[PDB]
Design a protein around this nucleic acid. Structure first.
Ligand SMILES: [Ca+2]
Length: 579
DNA sequence: GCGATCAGCG
DNA sequence: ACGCTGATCGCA
């Protein structure tokens, strides 16, 4: 139905200096994945190209890499990385429909060109899943069906750029797309392609050691239970704990007895089995997710893992990381933290360098709320988390353990983001009236935070959404819900999204500024990971000392707030040492 | 496939 | 009855 040239070679008119481009990669993980087809729509027509012809044509390759040839795309990072795996560079991406749709309304869950086109009443294109199918049935269709689908996706991109930019501009989000998210996309593509090298001999050794400790704990559980059972089975675990052993029931799930760690911790006074269950789950989580899981996704020839940072998924503007998730590598228990010893530089005599923001969301909050005491606290470079721990546990500063700090940190964000007296009581193991008076007290010291909580909720009711400092947006239609519970979850999102999203805006700007600076100074250091407020790099050891001044400065100057930004930084031979 | 659970970020 | 996530596993 749609007209296009099914082309056997590349011609000059496919290389105009503006086009909609589709480089189709069907597999979810696009690392080292087939490119199944190419479409180009421009002023001279609509063209389908087979990748074996276009990607071996030197003039098409030059066009891909020419930054003065502008491409409109959907999910351009996916194309850029699949092309990098083919040894081909993509430059000149000036519009990315996925990131435009994400910015306009992250709740759409826009995952293909069709879902984005629907936002503008454009429906002359099919959903990807209708063309390829799902699951075992998923397949690349016959070439004429493939070619028209790719041409219709590019025809859509061609038509939708203008209405999407128009609405971005009305939302004050046009520079957010063109100067933040699209430059970031190219940077994430370099980080993903570069990968992180893994010491598989060390991982494998930790795996055999764990499997031994697992059995020993597993046997002691069976002997404390007086029988054998599937310790991972909540049916059986619940039966053992709360029927055979008659331990008190403190919580239920939709499906039975809860055995979450906070329940198990409150049962430690009653029976010794519960802490063995705890230790068992921790060892098995390390084994399942971080030894075996990692080794599954290590590319064996290079010993690299190549994550995918999803840039159009979270409702706040954060990234997430998938397959493997390199944003939740263990750190807090020393047994788990050692897995970070298997993450190593990718070259001899290079080192890992990790820099991260100190208390970023509370500094953002002090700026946005304009709370005098909170601003004054960060002007003094106070550690609110440690001060809060001192108060909670009635200890001196030197007595504050890492445990108490991250516990006090959960109270600090709990209170600003709407924890109730009940939940704070359960989290702190204190009475519900103490919990409530503690909350009254903290708002006595930070009344400007309290006003911000009330003001932001009123502003979401009036406007229908909340924004971040760089104008990221999140609609909250449930804020006017008649249902008490639904409305409440929406109010807590109103309190939290502008703070967490602004912290996301800042580190994203930090990454763009950092890359420009590294390039300007002609350094080999390059980014490997982002972990929400943390940047991890690797670099030749000859560069460590320059990076100790460069990276913190770049991150601290990314934005200017009414309080300073603070950055800590470490480097070492493995990710474990970069602390 | 989903819900409970737990690893991380604040 | 703080918010944002992803992987694994049993299935009440
Ligand atoms: Ca931090």
């Amino acid at each position: 139905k749609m007209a296009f040239t099914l082309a056997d070679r590349v011609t000059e008119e496919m290389l105009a200096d503006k086009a909609a481009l589709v480089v189709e990669v069907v597999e979810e993980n696009y690392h080292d994945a087939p490119i199944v087809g190419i479409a180009v729509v421009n002023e001279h027509g609509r063209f389908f190209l087979r990748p074996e012809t276009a990607l071996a044509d030197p003039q098409f390759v030059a066009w891909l890499g020419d930054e003065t040839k502008k491409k409109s795309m959907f999910d351009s990072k996916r194309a850029a990385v699949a092309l990098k795996w083919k040894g081909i560079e993509l430059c000149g991406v000036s519009f990315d429909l996925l990131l435009a749709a994400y910015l306009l309304d992250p709740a759409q869950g826009v995952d293909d060109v069709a879902a984005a086109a629907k936002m503008k009443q454009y429906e002359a294109v099919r959903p990807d899943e209708a063309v390829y199918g799902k699951g075992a049935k998923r397949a690349v269709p016959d070439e004429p069906v493939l070619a028209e689908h790719l041409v219709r996706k590019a025809a859509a991109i061609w038509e939708l750029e203008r209405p999407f930019l128009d609405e971005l501009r009305r939302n004050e989000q046009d520079r957010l797309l063109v100067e933040l998210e699209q430059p970031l996309s190219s940077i994430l593509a370099e980080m993903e392609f570069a990968g992180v090298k893994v010491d598989t001999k060390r991982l494998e050794q930790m795996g055999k050691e764990l499997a031994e400790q697992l059995g020993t704990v597993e046997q002691r559980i069976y002997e404390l239970a007086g029988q054998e059972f599937n310790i991972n089975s909540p049916k059986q675990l619940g039966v053992i704990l709360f029927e055979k052993l008659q331990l008190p029931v403190l919580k239920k799930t939709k499906t039975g007895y809860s055995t979450s760690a906070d329940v198990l911790e409150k049962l430690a006074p009653y029976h010794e089995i519960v802490e063995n269950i705890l230790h068992y789950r921790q060892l098995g989580k390390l084994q399942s997710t971080y030894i075996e899981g990692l080794l599954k996704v290590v590319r064996p020839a290079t010993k690299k893992v190549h994550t995918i940072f999803n840039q159009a998924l979270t409702q706040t503007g954060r990234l997430s990381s998938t397959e493997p998730n390199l944003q939740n590598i263990p750190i807090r228990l020393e047994e788990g933290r050692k897995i970070r010893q298997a993450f190593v530089p990718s070259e001899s005599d290079w080192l890992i360098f990790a820099a991260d923001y100190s208390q970023i969301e509370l500094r953002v909050l002090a700026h946005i709320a304009e709370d005098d005491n909170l601003m004054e606290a960060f002007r003094r470079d106070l550690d609110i988390h440690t001060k809060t721990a001192m108060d909670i546990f009635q200890v001196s500063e030197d007595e504050v353990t890492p445990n108490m700090r991250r516990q006090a940190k959960a109270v600090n964000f709990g209170i600003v983001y709407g924890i109730s007296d009940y939940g704070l009581a359960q989290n702190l193991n204190i009475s519900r009236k103490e919990a409530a008076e503690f909350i009254e007290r903290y708002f006595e010291s930070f009344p400007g935070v309290k006003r911000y909580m009330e003001n932001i909720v009123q502003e979401a009711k009036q406007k229908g959404y909340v924004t971040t400092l760089l104008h990221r947006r999140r609609y909250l239609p449930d804020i006017t819900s008649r249902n008490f519970n639904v409305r409440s979850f929406a109010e807590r999102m109103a309190m939290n999204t502008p703070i967490q999203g602004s912290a996301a805006d800042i580190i994203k700007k930090a990454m763009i500024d950092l890359n420009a600076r590294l390039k300007e100074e002609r350094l080999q250091a390059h980014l490997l990971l982002q972990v929400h407020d943390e940047l991890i790099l690797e670099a030749p050891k000859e560069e460590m000392e320059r990076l100790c001044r460069l990276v913190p400065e770049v991150m601290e100057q990314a934005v200017t707030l009414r309080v300073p930004l603070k950055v800590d930084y470490h480097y070492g031979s493995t990710w474990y040492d970069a602390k």
